[PDB]
Amino acid sequence: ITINQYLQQVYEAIDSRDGASCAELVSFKHPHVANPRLQMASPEEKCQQVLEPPYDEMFAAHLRCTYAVGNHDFIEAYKCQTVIVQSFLRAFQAHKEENWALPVMYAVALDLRVFANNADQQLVKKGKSKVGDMLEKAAELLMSCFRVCASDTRAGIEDSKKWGMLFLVNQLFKIYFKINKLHLCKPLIRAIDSSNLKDDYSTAQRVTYKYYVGRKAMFDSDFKQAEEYLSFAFEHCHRSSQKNKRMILIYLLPVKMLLGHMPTVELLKKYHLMQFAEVTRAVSEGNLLLLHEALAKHEAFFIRCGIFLILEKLKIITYRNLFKKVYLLLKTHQLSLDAFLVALKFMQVEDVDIDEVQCILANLIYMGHVKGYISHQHQKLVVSKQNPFPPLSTV
């Protein structure tokens, strides 16, 4: 296909206000990238003489960018994509009370982020810069896009640019989850909640937003909200995209286990997350030795997933289950602390003394896991006649 035909198609799509065709002609998912005729070095004259600005600069930059990616010049590709996003945002804020060009943004925005990653990887291979150099600039550009999309308050909701909000937020989250900067997600999370379209977005963007917010809440020890979000993200996830469902389970399992819900063996085997299996078997049993062995054996996987320190908080649940087992076996409301000391020594915990047992029981009672009090003079934990160990859901 000659570049004249491509320019004519671009002009027809722009003049007809058809977002889908214009987005296709500028997105790298389209096969036209692979066309050798399309890739050219300096097609700026053709774009200038065919398309009015700022579309001319945007599409000339896109053509040189596809040439660069054909030559694998990812730094030049990222620079050209930044030029594309700037010119398109100018032409996008140009539109008044119309969001025909909303799909275009999506494609363009996505491409930028992807290129940024490769750019950073290139700078890792070249050794010039560190990791995340271009990702912050990518996040800045996407934040400008988000501001433009959220500024459209006067226009009617049918043709407002607010519909292009959540997608951009999701993109930002990805960057903010690759450079390990969670705090920057704080404004966006409220910005979505302020909008009245919090539930009117597409299913994919809503699911991605719920998953990211659930991850942030879990990392902030907000397991109730984290469960409320990740359950929705995992329930509404697309069946075809199994990788996303597994990634959501990776962060939903610790929250459910901390709140007292244990995954079945079938769920772990189905999604190939067998690494949790033994861990689960410990927590529901009160086996501290098994929990330590399973956390050490799968230490690398949990360290990579970033949930090792969240997983280690299951030791409190393991303590509660072990002490509940001791209470059930002894069948007495007034339990000598030496019984819990014996149980702890059975789990091969290093240098356990009665003082550590008292400390663990005091922490459990303070946290609400146990309803009782430890008489120190007699060294006896007196537990309640009714509801000695309340269910983990209420705690």
Binding site: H333, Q334, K371, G372, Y373, S375, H378, K380, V382, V383, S384, K385
Partner: peptide, 5 residues
């Protein structure tokens, strides 16, 4: 001993 209340 008195029980927890």
């Amino acid at each position: 001993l008195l029980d927890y209340e």
